[model samples]
Target: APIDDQLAELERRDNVLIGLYAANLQSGRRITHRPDEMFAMCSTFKGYVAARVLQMAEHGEISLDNRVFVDADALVPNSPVTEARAGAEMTLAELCQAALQRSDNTAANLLLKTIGGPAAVTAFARSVGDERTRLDRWEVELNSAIPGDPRDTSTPAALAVGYRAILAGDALSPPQRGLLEDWMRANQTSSMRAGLPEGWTTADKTGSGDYGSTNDAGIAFGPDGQRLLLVMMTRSQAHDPKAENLRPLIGELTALVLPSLL
Candidate 1:
């Protein structure tokens, strides 16, 4: 069947909005559905935070090896990793790893502050062919959502291009690029990749907020040497109102579109 019709399953679902974009690395053929609607990003925004830090390091504003100490009052957190690293001094490189690899809320919040905050990420986004992503809220603000909370918002189309740029290593130097690639490759949760064929691999980031969203974006490597830049963003309420409740849809979307791209 055609993909436009296939996308109806996502659009017709109850109280949910889904965005998808899959692009072939070698051929540059791309597929997009609901490409422009903004959705709350949750922890998936952490990838942007990680990128700006890498860009800053690339620009020599900050050295990744510099030790970062906990001096300010940290934001509210959702991970035990914060408690584990409290009062310990760590390099910015280590900070990025913690935030990106394990989806550490505390590490994300910490790096957000250190990398010149939201404005910096927004500014960085503009340079890489994006203008739609605006991240203003801390990890703490995500848990308590309001009717029109604009805390952090982005579209899958925008994020897909941005992630592809980052994944291609344009935002960082050679070694720094490898650091990010390795970091994303080591990303622990394969929530979106759960339904893919064996031997396929993803360098991805996943996010969920207390509000009602689950998002994942990154590069997928196929057995045929094809690479797919895939992104899926979902916001759901009523029937399926929880983050964990949306995992199957994410996996399904990946499984459905991945083959066409490969």
Candidate 2:
């Protein structure tokens, strides 16, 4: 009855339901329907980029505070961070924070370049055992290239594992992991955290587009000693009528499931 209630609410809002998966990391109980199906990551791809950065730091290939210069010519018009500055200096850490926290497109592109480009990031993804994740090369080109098909994508299973690796600190040295985990916690967008109560330790990222596609994925640490890994993607004209409408559904879903773990 309760599951139906949630699904009914989503359907009532006109969500084009394709697949869903929710897991309790502590209990290992899974609620899934078409969990293996693929979905476009949108800005959720930043998680993979962040992971690669941490891995590079752990291996001493780069430092988090490394400064990166952004040339005015590389700026993409209409992007949040790009429109702000033509040529400016930012640390790798700042770029990552902007990408993850602000969903800045220019920030993501710079970080991708800093981490050895799309091909290198892909190799790192595969090295960490993510076979189903392929970041289309065009996604890294910022405004220079036309947007690729959303079908250039990833699966929930792969994303779950990636978040798991982040939580476990397996992708980086302890210090680097701490830095990343902190950055993730600072992510203010409430697509996922909107569902949970205040003060829960949430490390997450949210993504949305004009096409009515929205996604959120992250790890949640509860006060009662529970940890969760969740990823939800949606395509809906009703639920995603705009940026405002999309967050409420995401918040509602997060609120519904988060307390169950507590």
Candidate 3:
């Protein structure tokens, strides 16, 4: 079956699927499965961090060009950035790149710290009109080093809103948005980008964690000038080896929807 047909078929079979939102940023045509449901965000929260960084830069609190060092002692164990040698100095740009591109956990923790701790991100989420988006604690800090707070949560709607703000240049200066977008484009994981038609350009972030949930959210540009924002969150039964069932589903959905909108 073709990608679109496959997604429609999945929707027909899987009843627990939460939310699906795809809007053509250019044509405004869209197809949705369930656009209002909420799910736990894995690494897709990096998109929120990206938005918060831009917001801080806009307020003169931080600079994209600012240099920060990733100390070995400060690095979180089992994180991707633990491989970075001690005392390595990297610009904010590099940190953002590692966070988005490589999904580097240490870099994300450092970036969260640089942006004025976890509360600042929560505040930013509220400032951007996201009622359901909250980062009560850092990713690693949750339930361990950092105390667990009830407010640690987010919704697909909030994530879409933040990405739209960045694209509209309302969250940060134009240059900063461009830089952030560029970093997202460099993301190597295809948990969301996979299964799309050839020659499509996608700016997306994917999240996979210990559970059976896998998510991908961002914008896709089709060959015929159709641009769309897509957010898909999925969770399977416990102990399921199929940790990332949503990737191919999202890819097929994009391929099926874009051409019609164009």
Candidate 4:
């Protein structure tokens, strides 16, 4: 089936809106479905926030090892690492790891605070040539996922392209890239990673929001060193809704796109 028709069929069957972008980094082959449509970025923006923090480190504006005391009052839910370390000091790099790998809300909020907040991350995305990705809110609140609201949103195409550039090692120093990639590879929340075939390496970040919005975007490497960047985003279109739990849909979308990109 044609990609558009296939996706449309799935959207109809699942009662959800979907966006997908898959690109073969070497061959330049690409596939997109609703790639320009906006969706809540949720915690997925933590990956870019991590990059912004690393970029600051590259420019000598901050040190990765610089430690900040995490206040217990500042923590939000789903913050395992930061909550556990509350009232203690953690290096900026360690906070970045918690945000990316564990999707720790407090960790992401602190990193955003260090990097000058959501506008700075949005600025970082623009500096890297992505105009459509904008992060306007912090954790928990950003995941509200209200229907048709544009705050804290990004297009699937923008994420796929931006992440490809960042992960390509050009946006940051080699060590910074390596550090970010290490965190992404260790991300524990990505259901899409399960869609990869055995022995294929991947680095991914996942996010969830209200109304069943779920997303995963990252780089995938086959055993032969073939590389691909894939993004999957989905959310319900109606506000009459409860959260739809799109984790399975994200995994299915990953499986559906890998064959063509790989």
lDDT of every model, 2 decimals: 0.76, 0.67, 0.66, 0.86
Please report the TM-score between candidate 3 and the true structure.
Answer: 0.82
**Best candidate, TM-score-wise?**
4
TM-score of each: 0.90, 0.83, 0.82, 0.96
- Give stretches of model 3 more than 4 Å off: 1-18, 141-151, 237-245
Task: Write model 3 residue lDDT over 1-262, tens digit each, in one string.
Answer: 2544655566666532545666777666666654555555667778778777766777888887798877887777545643574487777767777788877778778888888777777777677776665666676543121112234545667767766766543677788777777778888875556657677776788776433456788887668776778777655534444444556665665566556656
The 10-residue segment of model 2 with minimum total lDDT is 141-150
Better of 1 and 3 by lDDT: 1
lDDT of 2 by residue, 6-50 (tens): 665775666544344567887886655346766666677787788
Candidate 3 yields a Cα-based lDDT of: 0.66
Candidate 4: 10-residue stretch with minimal lDDT: 236-245
Name the best candidate (by lDDT). 4
Give lDDT tens digits, candidate 4, residues 49-152: 89988888898899999998899999999999998889999999999999989899999999999999989889888888777888888887988878878999
Ranking by lDDT: 4, 1, 2, 3
TM-score of 1: 0.90
- Over the full model, what C-alpha lDDT does candidate 1 score relative to the true structure? 0.76
Off by over 4 Å in 1: 13-15, 71-75, 143-148, 237-244
